[PDB]
A paper describes a structure:
The inner two capsid layers (composed of VP3 and VP7) comprise a core particle which remains intact following infection, whilst the outer layer contains two proteins, VP2 and VP5. VP2 is the attachment protein and protrudes from the virion surface, whilst VP5 is implicated in membrane penetration. Protein VP5 forms part of the outer layer of BTV, with two symmetric trimers of VP5 fitting like pegs into pits on the underlying core.
The low pH form was solved in the native state and refined at 2.2 Å. The low pH conformation at 2.2 Å provides a precise description of this state, presumed to be primed for host membrane engagement. Interestingly the electron density for this extended helix is clear, allowing a reliable model to be built, whereas the density in the cryo-EM reconstruction (EMDB 24684) fades quickly away from the main body of the VP5 subunit, despite which the cryo-EM model is similar to the X-ray structure in this region. Likewise the low pH structure confirms the extended helical protrusion that was inferred but poorly resolved in the previous cryo-EM structure. In summary we show that VP5 in isolation undergoes essentially the same changes with pH as seen in the virus and confirm the helical transition to produce spikes radiating from the virus surface. This indicates that VP5 is a pH driven motor during cell entry.
Residue numbers in the entry:
A (entry chain A), B (entry chain A), C (entry chain A): 65 to 139, 361 to 416, 423 to 515
The structure:
């Protein structure tokens, strides 16, 4: 039963009430932006039309009075940068999440949906004296960990290893309305909580990539 | 040649003239709904604008008369519930079609596009004295029949068997404007008529899932 | 570094600034057409509304004068036809590009994204006396060349061979604003220039099929 309501809330986010595009589709991202602009303009046009109706009605009244009178006298946000792996591009991809106001505050979130694996790493740099993997390293590491899975197909492992030594494909940026700290916590919830993870990392690829974004925006509340 | 016109009519349905969303994409379903609302509002705004133009013109005329006058004196529907299999989610999915006005009138339609198999079962309950598989059973049965295909890859069969003992992923509901009896007949046409079936169960996955819905709405008329 | 700007310009085309639909999705093609119509109508409605505001304001002024007056006296384009292979439909597809004003001027462009292969052939007929593969042949040939790739999976080769002897699935027509000669040159640039090709034939399938169209519209300028 518990499963029922989980599915229901998840489904409600990625249906209406959230304009989430597939992170691997810059085209769907454009389309979602275009629908939003159209909605916003249409609201504005409704306002203008009603303004014009009111001005018109007021002039009708004034016209009546002028008739009568004459008649008498007649007589910033965290940026989520998206990269697909050069192999199995639809299933293997990486987020680079950047804090808007710290030079070196960011984290990595890597996904292999073929084996349903997610890896998080903090990339922040912090100096301490009483008074830190690079992005590339995190990328390379991620392919090693994924190729480790016993669940990984022999052929899968081979493409993971080739992606590891190749350049990823940048697909652009998402910007949602939450803090660095919140998205960071969401990302870690995604990796640490096994239940949430099993609910997010499943179903048709297109839907699951949107659900991933929903999980980034809400964490466990993606099933609230 | 006959093939040509078939392709043409099929293509015409899933192009314009039918707002069919991919059943496995709640996001595309939302988008199609949003485009419809925008179209509907835009028609209404066109009407309001023209109303305002007419009222304005009428006031122009009235203003003329007032000028002249003063101048003289100057001197329900079946619900299609959609579930993806937990494995091969993009290719293996199930419809539960529910009659709007009978407590226990529904049917199952299961699809495996990897092997291009479709299975129909009536789930209705009818008592008879002169005066019936459950949904779960139909689900379990479906994976058995599919794993039977000689055409099924060894690995395919294994995931079918795992899906059989796992919980499917609900992706929501479609509601089209036809009767239970008609959609039911369409579903059976889909399974019984080999020609229609070969025309519906092919091509890129996204397109084929939309064509499936078109077939549910029109049956053989999907190629008329 | 050079890679960076390439990715950036590519991404800019298939983001905004170009309404490119996935060639394998007649549904997305319809949707893109619908968004365009809505945008076009909304611009027109904005114009009508402002016209009405101006007419209204002018009538307000006129009304004032009538009040005052009364008060005193008080005392063609190349067509790109799209066909998916009957097997591996999402990855194996063919363009038939037809000149608008020559009976027998067209070319073939075949793609297998599984092995990232593109094949171009001129299908034009030209008679010469001082004073030519068919479409089918080009189709059949294409599957032979693709099944030749050493990179091709054994199973891949088998489906290529079956597609070769079967009928492709027509998915419709795209029409972009360029000449036959230009698109023809673009198509050949795509096949001859190894760099462009490596930049176009990669990433998630949906994105890569859109990038292919972008390459057809711009050639090397797709990375300018």
């Amino acid at each position: 039963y518990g499963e029922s309501v989980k599915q229901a809330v998840i489904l409600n986010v990625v249906g209406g009430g959230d304009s989430i595009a597939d992170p691997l589709s810059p085209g769907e991202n454009d389309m979602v932006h275009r629908l939003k602009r159209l909605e916003d303009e249409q609201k504005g046009e409704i306002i203008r039309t009603k303004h014009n109706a009111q001005v018109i009605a007021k002039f009708g009244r004034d016209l009546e009075d002028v008739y009568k009178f004459a008649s008498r006298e007649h007589k910033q946000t965290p940026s989520i940068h998206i990269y697909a792996a050069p192999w199995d591009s639809d299933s293997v991809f990486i987020f680079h999440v950047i804090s808007p106001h710290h030079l070196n505050e960011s984290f990595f979130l890597g996904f292999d949906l073929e084996i349903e694996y997610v890896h998080y790493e903090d990339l922040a740099q912090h100096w301490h004296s009483l008074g830190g993997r690079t992005f590339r390293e995190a990328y390379r590491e991620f392919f090693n960990l994924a190729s480790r899975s016993t669940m990984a197909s022999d052929i899968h492992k081979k493409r993971l290893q080739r992606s590891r030594m190749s350049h990823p494909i940048y697909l652009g940026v998402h910007n949602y309305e939450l803090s660095y700290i919140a998205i960071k916590s969401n990302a870690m919830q995604l990796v640490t909580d096994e239940d949430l993870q099993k609910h997010v990392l499943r179903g048709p690829l297109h839907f699951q990539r949107r659900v991933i974004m929903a999980a980034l925006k809400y964490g466990v509340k993606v099933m609230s």
